[PDB]
Design a protein around this motif. Structure first.
Motif, short mmCIF file in Angstrom:
data_model
loop_
_atom_site.label_atom_id
_atom_site.label_comp_id
_atom_site.label_asym_id
_atom_site.label_seq_id
_atom_site.Cartn_x
_atom_site.Cartn_y
_atom_site.Cartn_z
N UNK A 34 0.82 -1.20 0.00
CA UNK A 34 0.00 0.00 0.00
C UNK A 34 0.86 1.25 0.00
N UNK A 35 1.91 1.29 0.82
CA UNK A 35 2.76 2.47 0.84
C UNK A 35 3.43 2.67 -0.51
N UNK A 36 3.91 1.58 -1.12
CA UNK A 36 4.52 1.68 -2.44
C UNK A 36 3.53 2.23 -3.47
N UNK A 37 2.27 1.83 -3.38
CA UNK A 37 1.26 2.31 -4.33
C UNK A 37 0.87 3.75 -4.07
N UNK A 38 1.11 4.27 -2.87
CA UNK A 38 0.81 5.64 -2.53
C UNK A 38 -0.13 5.83 -1.36
N UNK A 39 -0.57 4.77 -0.67
CA UNK A 39 -1.37 4.96 0.53
C UNK A 39 -0.58 5.71 1.58
N UNK A 40 -1.25 6.64 2.26
CA UNK A 40 -0.61 7.41 3.32
C UNK A 40 -1.44 7.43 4.60
N UNK A 41 -2.50 6.63 4.68
CA UNK A 41 -3.42 6.66 5.81
C UNK A 41 -3.67 5.20 6.19
N UNK A 42 -3.40 4.86 7.45
CA UNK A 42 -3.50 3.49 7.93
C UNK A 42 -4.30 3.48 9.22
N UNK A 43 -5.33 2.64 9.27
CA UNK A 43 -6.28 2.62 10.39
C UNK A 43 -6.05 1.36 11.23
N UNK A 44 -5.45 1.53 12.40
CA UNK A 44 -5.12 0.44 13.31
C UNK A 44 -5.98 0.55 14.57
N UNK A 45 -5.79 -0.39 15.49
CA UNK A 45 -6.50 -0.36 16.76
C UNK A 45 -5.79 -1.26 17.75
N UNK A 46 -5.82 -0.87 19.02
CA UNK A 46 -5.24 -1.71 20.06
C UNK A 46 -5.86 -3.11 20.04
N UNK A 47 -7.18 -3.18 19.90
CA UNK A 47 -7.82 -4.46 20.10
C UNK A 47 -7.74 -5.38 18.88
N UNK A 48 -7.20 -4.89 17.76
CA UNK A 48 -6.87 -5.82 16.68
C UNK A 48 -5.73 -6.75 17.06
N UNK A 49 -4.98 -6.41 18.12
CA UNK A 49 -3.85 -7.23 18.61
C UNK A 49 -2.73 -7.31 17.58
N UNK A 50 -2.61 -6.29 16.74
CA UNK A 50 -1.61 -6.27 15.68
C UNK A 50 -0.75 -5.01 15.70
N UNK A 51 -0.82 -4.18 16.76
CA UNK A 51 -0.12 -2.90 16.71
C UNK A 51 1.39 -3.11 16.56
N UNK A 52 1.96 -4.14 17.22
CA UNK A 52 3.41 -4.37 17.07
C UNK A 52 3.74 -4.70 15.62
N UNK A 53 2.91 -5.52 14.98
CA UNK A 53 3.18 -5.89 13.59
C UNK A 53 2.97 -4.71 12.65
N UNK A 54 1.96 -3.87 12.93
CA UNK A 54 1.74 -2.67 12.13
C UNK A 54 2.95 -1.75 12.26
N UNK A 92 0.59 3.16 25.41
CA UNK A 92 0.90 1.79 25.03
C UNK A 92 0.80 1.60 23.53
N UNK A 93 -0.27 2.14 22.90
CA UNK A 93 -0.37 2.10 21.44
C UNK A 93 0.85 2.72 20.78
N UNK A 94 1.30 3.87 21.28
CA UNK A 94 2.49 4.50 20.71
C UNK A 94 3.71 3.60 20.84
N UNK A 95 3.88 2.97 22.01
CA UNK A 95 5.02 2.09 22.23
C UNK A 95 4.99 0.92 21.24
N UNK A 96 3.82 0.28 21.08
CA UNK A 96 3.74 -0.87 20.19
C UNK A 96 3.91 -0.48 18.73
N UNK A 97 3.38 0.68 18.34
CA UNK A 97 3.48 1.16 16.96
C UNK A 97 4.84 1.77 16.65
#
Lengths: 310, 303
Positions: A34-54, A92-97
């Motif tokens: 997505x970033x390569x294609x030009x996306x600049x907006x990414x919608x994450x959430x703590x409860x997706x349990x993926x913030x570290x991977x994001x 915590x979100x900032x730390x994981x992201x």
């Protein structure tokens, strides 16, 4: 132009990548592609349990020179279990992201449930296997702590997720910092005209999660109703030489409602971002307006044991 | 057992007469006939524009010895235009009803709109014919003023109207006086079990307005399940529908003027539904909302 001005002056890309239900290698490839294609907006959430991977994917993209942090618009959300712990949940979100600030921080639902630890969000059940809904922390108390994340410099913009007219009017009436964004399900089969119009009247940008309704580009079983199968959208896709998804997304963009479609497939990522490159004619917007079904598709798990939309 | 105990100890009759859309001689006769039959609970509202006539009928009933004030449970409601004028609106309702106190006072909707004058409630429209929704008075501020009507002795019990789970949880989290009642549309085609159960968990009595549900049209009274249970119990379909709410601790305020229907609705207290038949009714929920604000508001508040 590819952005919309929020009521605090920040520009937000009107197309974002929704990250709900993306994980592991698929999540990594989706964010990089997505970033390569030009996306600049990414919608994450703590409860997706993926913030570290994001955070790991964004870090790779920045370190590989694909994009700069200041060019990205990154959202996360405080879970129902942290309505009494907003500031620490935000840290915590900032730390994981691996971020020093968030562009947007949303209250994930207008619902407080039992706290399960900062960074370990959960939807805890009571003795009867019913969601342990809290009756001690008001939505206003939560909102004033959202305002603290702004005054602390953790977060640029704050907003609502899954709030409707009554709750949004209430927020506007007690807010010291008016919400910048209200995110909720809306698409051609759940158009919610009154809610979108009300947000806009008061300078709140409504944002569509689930902007394609039930729809995915996969082969699937029978029994899943979606605006993308509506003959009106199929005909418009033929007219404009676009996919039905592109027509659905552009319809929200035309009314000032940014969209966060979910996808990992490069062809579809590209198509969704190319919604920026065409416009729907006025009469075709009005045609799509006729197909509203008032049909809600994005629901909490049945494991909550409570229908919050009862 | 004709009453349910509210969380502050006051008893509330589980069958009441809903007064929405009753006026003039029909309203006066309905109230007098209801009282003679045994009704003790009457659901009024400032925005019905009938409080003077309601108060005249109740006064006539008391004056003729049919009933005493202390035996009656009278409800009114503060309109959307008065969320910033709650005490004034409450005193105005008391003046029009010729009462010293209300048994129950409800916030009619979880929505504030532009003020239109105390005693002259209205739903004002903005420049584009869209409801002029207020963004200055919070529901909590309104609720603390509902608490002030209790503090002033104007009102015994206070509660919510047309609030759902998110708004009710929020009220419980900031209230100093927990609401006694939450009144909302619920009937066999719009069962709202999660909301009923949530209210009860926290000691709030859920109360069913529109308890019988809904060209041509649609109604739970036409469902084959209710029709079959009516024949099984030798009751009317409306009596089955009302008893179903009573069985789950949800009082009902059916609207009716005709003496035969008033009598049948009150006799819902005289029979019980079997467990398996309740469960049969539970299967017919359609999540079907029938009581909507006027289209003249220009806003779908349930959008």
């Amino acid at each position: 132009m590819s952005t919309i001005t929020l009521n605090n002056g920040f520009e937000m890309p009107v197309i974002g990548l929704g990250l709900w239900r993306l994980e592991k290698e698929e999540l990594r490839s989706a964010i990089l592609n997505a970033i390569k294609l030009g996306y600049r907006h990414f919608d994450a959430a703590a409860h997706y349990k993926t913030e570290i991977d994001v955070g790991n994917a964004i870090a790779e993209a920045i370190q590989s020179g694909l994009v700069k942090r200041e060019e990205l618009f990154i959202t996360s959300k405080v879970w129902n279990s942290d309505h009494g712990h907003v500031v620490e949940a935000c840290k915590n979100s900032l730390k994981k992201l691996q971020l020093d600030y968030l562009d947007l921080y949303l209250v994930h639902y207008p619902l407080a449930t039992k706290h399960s630890g900062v960074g370990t969000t959960a939807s805890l059940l009571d003795e009867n296997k019913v969601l342990d809904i809290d009756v001690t922390v008001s939505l206003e108390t939560t909102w004033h702590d959202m305002e603290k994340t702004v005054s602390l410099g953790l977060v640029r913009s704050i907003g609502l997720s899954n709030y409707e007219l009554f709750l949004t009017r209430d927020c506007l009436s007690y807010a010291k910092i008016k919400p910048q964004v209200s995110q909720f399900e809306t698409h051609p089969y759940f158009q919610r005209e009154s809610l979108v119009r009300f947000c806009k009247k008061h300078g709140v940008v409504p944002m569509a999660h689930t902007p394609l309704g039930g729809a995915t580009a996969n082969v699937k079983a029978f029994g899943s109703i979606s605006p993308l199968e509506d003959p009106v959208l199929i005909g418009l896709a033929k007219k404009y030489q676009k996919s039905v998804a592109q027509i659905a997304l552009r319809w929200n963009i035309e009314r000032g409602t940014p969209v966060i479609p979910k996808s990992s497939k490069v062809e579809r990522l590209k198509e969704n971002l190319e919604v920026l490159n065409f416009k729907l004619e006025k009469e075709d917007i009005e045609l799509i307006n006729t197909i509203d079904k008032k049909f809600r598709t994005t629901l909490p798990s049945l494991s909550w044991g409570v229908d919050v939309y009862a």
